Design a binder for this molecule. Structure first.
Ligand code: 76M
Ligand code: ZN
Ligand code: ZN
Ligand code: ZN
Length: 246
């Protein structure tokens, strides 16, 4: 039939907002109604189970692209020459991009840009429980036995795996794309390695934020990939990195 501009529609039961992730009672209400994802423990920094001073002239960006710390993926300290105005303390100040959580047709929940994000914009820290090999192997078996639909593991370093299944932040919702618009970067903050999502191109407002989910991509089992990209590899998992054998 003939289509028309719809009338203005207001909700009656108030809509769920991003600040409701810091409000457990409202979140659990919204989740029952399917207006928010299943509850998890929102954490501000990683939970463990088991010097560097730039030459930036005090200030049009304070500790911009030429900052000797930034160049090595090291954050500045409170002693930075630019003091409070240092732009290279993003993890410490939790200077996350403007993001919104969305419900996708096929992949579950996801993350979208709420503003245009330039290339190499800090999106969010990937926070979770930091697991040793033993705990990781146990939880892999635990999650497999429970038939978990989604995975939230990310390697931090060769002996440490972040698990955001139970505890983390909204970065846990990031979905895989075969042609992604974000990457992870591992930054040193007060001597401790932390991992965050960063855009790899200009991401326009309203676009889903996506990454190459390496943990699953190179794992043994596979699943249908719903990324929709022009050169989608068809499935996620069961792949090996390039090698030249024999
Ligand atoms: C390490 C973190 C960032 C990993 N974050 C989850 C998001 C779950 C979130 N959607 C939800 O609802 O809580 C990955 C899982 O999401 C699914 N997922 C993603 N991208 C898919 C694709 N392109 N095709 C199919 N499933 C795809 C898959 O199960 C993956 O393990
Ligand atoms: Zn600097
Ligand atoms: Zn600085
Ligand atoms: Zn794909």
């Amino acid at each position: 039939g003939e289509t028309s501009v719809p009338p203005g529609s207001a909700l009656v039961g108030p809509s769920c907002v991003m600040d409701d992730f810091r409000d457990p009672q409202r979140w659990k209400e919204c989740a029952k109604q399917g207006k928010m994802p299943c509850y998890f423990d929102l954490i501000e920094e990683n939970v463990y189970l088991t010097r560097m001073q730039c030459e930036c002239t005090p200030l049009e960006i304070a500790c911009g692209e030429d900052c000797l710390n930034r160049l090595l993926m090291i954050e500045c300290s409170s002693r930075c020459p630019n003091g409070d105005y240092c732009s290279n303390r993003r993890f410490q100040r939790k200077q996350h991009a403007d993001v919104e959580v969305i419900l996708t047709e096929k992949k579950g929940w996801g993350l979208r840009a709420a503003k245009d994000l330039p290339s190499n914009t800090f999106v969010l820290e990937y926070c979770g429980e930091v697991l040793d090999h033993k705990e990781f192997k146990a939880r892999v078996k635990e999650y497999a036995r429970n038939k978990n639909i989604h995975y939230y593991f990310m390697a931090l370093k060769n002996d440490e795996i972040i698990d955001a299944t139970q505890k983390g932040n909204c970065s846990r919702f990031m979905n895989h794309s075969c042609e992604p618009n974000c990457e992870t970067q591992k930054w040193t903050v007060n001597g401790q390695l932390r991992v965050g999502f960063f855009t790899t191109k200009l991401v326009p407002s309203g676009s889903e934020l996506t990454f190459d989910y390496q943990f699953q991509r190179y794992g043994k089992e596979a699943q249908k990939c719903f990324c929709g990209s022009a050169n989608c590899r068809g499935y996620l998992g069961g792949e090996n990195r390039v090698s030249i054998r024999a």
